[PDB]
Protein backbone atom coordinates (compact mmCIF):
# COMPACT_ATOMS: atom_id res chain seq x y z
CA UNK A 1 0.00 0.00 0.00
CA UNK A 2 1.21 3.32 -1.03
CA UNK A 3 0.28 5.73 2.00
CA UNK A 4 1.57 9.22 1.89
CA UNK A 5 2.47 10.27 5.19
CA UNK A 6 1.26 13.15 7.01
CA UNK A 7 3.97 13.25 10.20
CA UNK A 8 6.71 16.10 9.39
CA UNK A 9 10.09 14.65 9.14
CA UNK A 10 12.74 15.78 11.50
CA UNK A 11 16.33 15.40 11.20
CA UNK A 12 18.37 16.97 14.65
CA UNK A 13 21.64 18.65 14.14
CA UNK A 14 24.04 18.33 16.72
CA UNK A 15 24.17 15.44 18.88
CA UNK A 16 25.90 16.90 22.36
CA UNK A 17 23.47 16.82 25.12
CA UNK A 18 20.70 19.07 23.84
CA UNK A 19 20.64 16.98 20.46
CA UNK A 20 20.93 14.02 22.67
CA UNK A 21 17.47 14.96 24.64
CA UNK A 22 15.44 16.09 21.15
CA UNK A 23 16.43 12.71 20.23
CA UNK A 24 15.09 10.86 23.28
CA UNK A 25 11.89 13.38 23.31
CA UNK A 26 11.42 12.52 19.49
CA UNK A 27 10.69 8.77 20.80
CA UNK A 28 8.33 9.59 23.00
CA UNK A 29 4.34 9.04 22.26
CA UNK A 30 4.00 12.76 22.67
CA UNK A 31 6.45 13.36 19.24
CA UNK A 32 4.32 10.01 17.93
CA UNK A 33 1.24 11.46 15.84
CA UNK A 34 3.07 14.26 14.15
CA UNK A 35 6.73 14.03 14.14
CA UNK A 36 8.87 11.23 12.33
CA UNK A 37 12.71 11.23 13.79
CA UNK A 38 14.37 10.78 9.80
CA UNK A 39 18.24 10.73 11.26
CA UNK A 40 20.84 13.14 12.78
CA UNK A 41 23.92 15.25 11.16
CA UNK A 42 26.94 15.70 12.90
CA UNK A 43 30.38 16.97 12.32
CA UNK A 44 31.59 13.52 13.56
CA UNK A 45 31.33 9.88 11.98
CA UNK A 46 29.08 8.37 13.89
CA UNK A 47 26.97 6.62 11.25
CA UNK A 48 24.13 5.85 13.79
CA UNK A 49 22.61 6.34 17.14
CA UNK A 50 20.43 3.21 18.40
CA UNK A 51 18.26 3.16 15.52
CA UNK A 52 18.81 6.21 14.51
CA UNK A 53 20.80 6.81 11.49
CA UNK A 54 23.35 9.49 10.45
CA UNK A 55 22.74 12.07 7.71
CA UNK A 56 25.09 13.82 5.75
CA UNK A 57 24.31 17.52 6.26
CA UNK A 58 24.32 17.88 2.28
CA UNK A 59 21.69 14.81 2.23
CA UNK A 60 19.84 16.63 4.50
CA UNK A 61 19.60 19.49 2.87
CA UNK A 62 18.68 17.73 -0.39
CA UNK A 63 15.95 15.14 1.50
CA UNK A 64 12.57 15.64 0.63
CA UNK A 65 10.80 13.51 3.40
CA UNK A 66 12.81 16.02 6.04
CA UNK A 67 10.44 18.84 6.25
CA UNK A 68 12.30 19.98 9.86
CA UNK A 69 15.62 20.68 11.28
CA UNK A 70 16.28 20.98 14.85
CA UNK A 71 19.25 22.97 15.63
CA UNK A 72 20.86 21.84 18.68
CA UNK A 73 24.60 22.07 18.28
CA UNK A 74 26.95 25.13 20.25
CA UNK A 75 25.37 28.98 19.54
CA UNK A 76 28.21 29.81 17.23
CA UNK A 77 26.98 27.44 14.80
CA UNK A 78 23.45 28.39 15.16
CA UNK A 79 23.08 31.01 12.53
CA UNK A 80 25.04 29.23 9.86
CA UNK A 81 22.59 25.79 10.25
CA UNK A 82 19.76 28.15 10.14
CA UNK A 83 20.15 29.90 7.05
CA UNK A 84 21.32 26.82 5.24
CA UNK A 85 18.24 24.58 6.45
CA UNK A 86 15.67 27.73 5.78
CA UNK A 87 16.78 28.32 2.32
CA UNK A 88 16.84 24.58 1.77
CA UNK A 89 13.02 24.89 2.77
CA UNK A 90 13.02 23.46 5.92
CA UNK A 91 11.10 24.68 9.10
CA UNK A 92 13.79 25.11 12.03
CA UNK A 93 13.10 24.42 15.67
CA UNK A 94 17.01 26.21 17.31
CA UNK A 95 17.65 26.13 20.89
CA UNK A 96 18.45 29.67 22.09
CA UNK A 97 20.51 31.87 21.19
CA UNK A 98 19.61 31.75 17.57
CA UNK A 99 22.39 33.93 17.00
CA UNK A 100 25.24 35.71 18.75
CA UNK A 101 24.07 39.38 16.07
CA UNK A 102 20.98 41.40 16.35
CA UNK A 103 21.68 41.75 12.26
CA UNK A 104 21.39 37.70 11.51
CA UNK A 105 18.88 37.26 13.47
CA UNK A 106 16.82 40.31 11.64
CA UNK A 107 18.17 38.47 8.37
CA UNK A 108 17.01 34.66 9.52
CA UNK A 109 13.06 36.07 10.16
CA UNK A 110 13.08 37.93 7.14
CA UNK A 111 14.45 34.24 4.96
CA UNK A 112 11.76 32.24 6.99
CA UNK A 113 9.50 34.32 5.96
CA UNK A 114 10.72 34.21 2.63
CA UNK A 115 10.40 30.62 2.21
CA UNK A 116 7.32 30.27 4.62
CA UNK A 117 8.81 28.48 7.23
CA UNK A 118 8.12 28.39 10.73
CA UNK A 119 11.45 29.38 12.71
CA UNK A 120 11.35 28.55 16.64
CA UNK A 121 13.61 29.99 19.29
CA UNK A 122 13.01 27.71 22.06
CA UNK A 123 12.73 29.44 25.41
CA UNK A 124 12.24 26.61 28.04
CA UNK A 125 12.66 29.15 30.73
CA UNK A 126 9.48 30.31 29.97
CA UNK A 127 8.05 27.37 30.80
CA UNK A 128 9.77 26.62 34.37
CA UNK A 129 7.68 25.60 37.33
CA UNK A 130 10.12 28.85 38.88
CA UNK A 131 8.53 31.23 36.37
CA UNK A 132 4.71 30.33 36.66
CA UNK A 133 5.31 31.02 40.24
CA UNK A 134 6.88 34.32 38.86
CA UNK A 135 4.32 35.14 36.61
CA UNK A 136 1.61 34.81 39.63
CA UNK A 137 3.58 36.60 41.90
CA UNK A 138 4.18 39.94 39.54
CA UNK A 139 0.22 39.70 38.44
CA UNK A 140 -0.95 43.23 39.81
CA UNK A 141 1.99 44.28 41.29
CA UNK A 142 4.18 47.46 40.79
CA UNK A 143 8.13 46.89 40.39
CA UNK A 144 9.93 49.66 42.14
CA UNK A 145 13.81 47.59 42.04
CA UNK A 146 15.16 44.21 42.06
CA UNK A 147 18.06 42.42 40.91
CA UNK A 148 18.32 38.62 39.36
CA UNK A 149 21.90 37.26 39.28
CA UNK A 150 22.77 33.59 38.28
CA UNK A 151 26.13 31.78 39.14
CA UNK A 152 28.07 29.38 37.04
CA UNK A 153 31.13 27.58 35.99
CA UNK A 154 33.22 28.78 33.05
CA UNK A 155 31.59 28.80 29.51
CA UNK A 156 33.88 28.82 26.39
CA UNK A 157 32.96 32.23 24.85
CA UNK A 158 34.11 31.41 21.47
CA UNK A 159 31.43 28.61 21.52
CA UNK A 160 28.94 29.35 23.50
CA UNK A 161 28.68 32.92 23.33
CA UNK A 162 29.19 36.52 25.09
CA UNK A 163 27.83 36.04 28.58
CA UNK A 164 24.38 38.16 27.48
CA UNK A 165 23.96 35.96 25.02
CA UNK A 166 24.51 32.37 26.37
CA UNK A 167 22.92 33.56 29.63
CA UNK A 168 20.28 35.47 27.99
CA UNK A 169 17.78 33.44 29.36
CA UNK A 170 17.57 35.56 32.54
CA UNK A 171 17.15 38.51 30.46
CA UNK A 172 14.28 37.06 28.67
CA UNK A 173 12.60 35.85 32.40
CA UNK A 174 13.00 39.97 33.25
CA UNK A 175 11.63 41.27 29.68
CA UNK A 176 8.60 38.76 29.92
CA UNK A 177 7.49 39.16 33.32
CA UNK A 178 8.43 43.02 32.90
CA UNK A 179 8.16 44.30 29.56
CA UNK A 180 10.60 46.04 26.99
CA UNK A 181 13.66 47.60 28.82
CA UNK A 182 15.58 50.57 28.62
CA UNK A 183 19.81 49.47 28.57
CA UNK A 184 21.49 52.15 31.51
CA UNK A 185 25.08 50.38 31.82
CA UNK A 186 26.86 47.34 31.15
CA UNK A 187 30.10 46.51 32.95
CA UNK A 188 32.57 43.63 32.33
CA UNK A 189 34.99 42.07 35.01
CA UNK A 190 37.57 39.31 33.44
CA UNK A 191 40.39 37.17 34.93
CA UNK A 192 40.85 34.56 32.24
CA UNK A 193 43.96 33.15 34.04
CA UNK A 194 41.50 32.31 36.46
CA UNK A 195 38.34 31.57 34.11
CA UNK A 196 36.46 34.38 36.05
CA UNK A 197 34.07 36.55 34.97
CA UNK A 198 31.31 38.92 36.30
CA UNK A 199 28.58 41.12 34.08
CA UNK A 200 26.82 43.84 35.42
CA UNK A 201 23.79 45.09 33.42
CA UNK A 202 21.58 48.29 35.02
CA UNK A 203 18.32 48.09 33.32
CA UNK A 204 14.90 50.09 33.63
CA UNK A 205 11.38 49.27 32.82
CA UNK A 206 9.08 51.61 31.41
CA UNK A 207 7.25 51.99 34.81
CA UNK A 208 10.72 53.64 35.82
CA UNK A 209 11.40 50.28 37.71
CA UNK A 210 15.23 49.70 38.29
CA UNK A 211 16.56 45.85 37.79
CA UNK A 212 20.45 44.73 37.91
CA UNK A 213 21.03 42.01 35.64
CA UNK A 214 24.52 39.97 37.00
CA UNK A 215 25.88 36.63 35.31
CA UNK A 216 29.06 35.30 37.38
CA UNK A 217 31.22 32.59 36.47
CA UNK A 218 34.22 31.03 37.71
CA UNK A 219 36.00 27.51 39.10
CA UNK A 220 34.04 26.16 41.66
CA UNK A 221 30.98 28.01 41.43
CA UNK A 222 27.55 26.20 41.84
CA UNK A 223 24.53 26.86 39.06
CA UNK A 224 22.72 28.68 41.35
CA UNK A 225 19.94 31.72 40.76
CA UNK A 226 19.28 34.76 42.99
CA UNK A 227 16.00 36.55 42.94
CA UNK A 228 15.28 40.24 44.66
CA UNK A 229 12.36 41.95 43.62
CA UNK A 230 11.29 44.94 45.33
CA UNK A 231 7.26 45.47 44.69
CA UNK A 232 5.34 48.52 46.54
CA UNK A 233 3.28 45.51 48.03
CA UNK A 234 5.68 42.94 49.70
CA UNK A 235 8.77 41.81 48.59
CA UNK A 236 9.96 38.45 46.86
CA UNK A 237 13.76 37.48 47.88
CA UNK A 238 13.09 33.42 47.13
CA UNK A 239 11.58 31.33 44.44
CA UNK A 240 10.64 27.66 45.34
CA UNK A 241 12.27 24.57 43.03
CA UNK A 242 9.71 21.86 44.67
CA UNK A 243 9.76 19.94 41.23
CA UNK A 244 12.33 18.86 38.70
CA UNK A 245 10.80 20.57 35.74
CA UNK A 246 9.63 17.07 34.19
CA UNK A 247 8.89 17.48 30.22
CA UNK A 248 10.09 20.92 29.82
CA UNK A 249 11.67 19.93 26.65
CA UNK A 250 8.68 18.55 25.55
CA UNK A 251 6.93 21.00 26.39
CA UNK A 252 8.71 22.93 23.79
CA UNK A 253 8.17 21.06 21.45
CA UNK A 254 4.47 21.04 21.60
CA UNK A 255 4.59 24.52 20.90
CA UNK A 256 6.72 24.12 17.93
CA UNK A 257 3.82 21.31 16.41
CA UNK A 258 1.27 23.84 16.86
CA UNK A 259 3.28 26.07 14.78
CA UNK A 260 3.64 23.70 12.75
CA UNK A 261 -0.54 23.02 12.52
CA UNK A 262 -1.13 26.63 11.97
CA UNK A 263 -2.57 26.61 15.42
CA UNK A 264 -1.19 30.00 16.74
CA UNK A 265 -2.49 33.50 16.22
CA UNK A 266 -0.70 35.97 14.23
CA UNK A 267 -0.84 38.01 17.08
CA UNK A 268 0.63 35.11 19.19
CA UNK A 269 2.90 34.44 16.71
CA UNK A 270 3.95 38.73 16.71
CA UNK A 271 3.98 38.83 20.41
CA UNK A 272 6.72 36.32 20.55
CA UNK A 273 9.27 37.48 17.60
CA UNK A 274 8.93 41.03 19.14
CA UNK A 275 9.99 40.13 22.78
CA UNK A 276 12.88 37.68 20.99
CA UNK A 277 14.73 40.04 19.22
CA UNK A 278 14.07 42.85 21.86
CA UNK A 279 15.93 40.63 24.13
CA UNK A 280 18.72 40.20 21.35
CA UNK A 281 18.82 43.49 20.19
CA UNK A 282 20.00 44.13 23.89
CA UNK A 283 22.61 41.65 24.42
CA UNK A 284 23.80 43.04 21.58
CA UNK A 285 23.97 46.61 23.03
CA UNK A 286 25.58 44.92 26.26
CA UNK A 287 28.30 43.23 24.55
CA UNK A 288 28.76 46.68 22.89
CA UNK A 289 29.19 48.67 26.03
CA UNK A 290 31.18 45.72 27.73
Given at each position: ??????????????????????????????????????????????????????????????????????????????????????????????????????????????????????????????????????????????????????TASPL???????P???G???????????????????????????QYMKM???????????????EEKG??L?????????????????????????????????????????????????????????????????????
Open positions: MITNSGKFGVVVVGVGRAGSVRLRDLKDPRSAAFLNLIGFVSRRELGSLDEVRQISLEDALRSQEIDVAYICSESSSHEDYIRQFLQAGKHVLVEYPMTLSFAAAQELWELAAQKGRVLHEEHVELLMEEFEFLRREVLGKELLKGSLRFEEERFGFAFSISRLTWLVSLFGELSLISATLEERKEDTVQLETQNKGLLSWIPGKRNRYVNFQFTSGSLEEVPSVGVNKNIFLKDQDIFVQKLLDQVSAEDLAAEKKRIMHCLGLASDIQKLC
